[PDB]
Amino acid sequence: ALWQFNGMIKCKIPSSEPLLDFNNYGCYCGLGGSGTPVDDLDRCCQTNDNCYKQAKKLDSCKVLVDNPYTNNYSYSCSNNEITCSSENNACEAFICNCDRNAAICFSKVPYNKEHKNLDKKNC
Ligand SMILES: [Ca+2]
Ligand SMILES: [Ca+2]
Ligand SMILES: [Cl-]
Secondary structure (H helix, E strand, O other), rough: OHHHHHHHHHHHHHOOHHHHOOOEEOEEEEOOOOOOOOOOHHHHHHHHHHHHHHHHHHHHHHHOOOOOOOOOOOOOEEEOOOEEEEOOHHHHHHHHHHHHHHHHHHHHOOHHHHHOOOOOHOO
């Protein structure tokens, strides 16, 4: 769920408010996404977007009355390291991994303010 994703990003980037810094950025960071990613951070979001898409394809996820944005899963942040729980069932575990990968990706690429609140005509 979005709440967990937010926590994961703060886990890797303690100085950030993910729902603000990583929302409405580039062509993919935020609800939806299309076009060519504008930078590596945007590409991180595209990958996470595609990961969610693959999740929806899983039989495990079709049974859930929740979407990746509201589907709660379990994880822990310790010493700024993210760990997905073995108590997560198939769908939740897949989503947890999608988010963990993105949070780590976000923390390893440049953040370009010029791409924040990007004019969708660039997508
Ligand atoms: Ca997106
Ligand atoms: Ca386009
Ligand atoms: Cl980690």
